Amino acid sequence: HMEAEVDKLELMFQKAESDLDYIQYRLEYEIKTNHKNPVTLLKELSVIKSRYQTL
C-alpha cells in the first residue's frame, strides 16, 4: 500500500536522476565537439594583483 506509494516516489527520483544525468551528458557532448577559460584567468589575476603591490 503506502509501500506502493513509496515504490512510486523511488521510481520518480530515479527518473529525476537520469533526467539530470542526460542534461549533463549533453552539455558534455556539446563541449567535446567544440575545439583561455576562467580557471587560469584567476591565477593570472592574482599573480598580477600581487606583484603590482610588490612593485
Binding site: 598580477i48 594583483k49 603590482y52 612593485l55
Partner: protein, 50 residues
Amino acid sequence: QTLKDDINILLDKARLENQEGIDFIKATKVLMEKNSMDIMKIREYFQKYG
C-alpha cells in the same frame, strides 16, 4: 581595467621620478660649475687683491 590603469599610472610616476631625478643631478652639476668659478674667482682675488 582599473587594475591596468593603476599599474599603468604607477609606471608613469616612476618614469618621472627617474627623470625629475636624472635631470636634477645635471641641473645641480651646472650650479656646481658656476659656484666653482665663483670661488676660484673669489680665491684668485683675495690672494692678490688686484
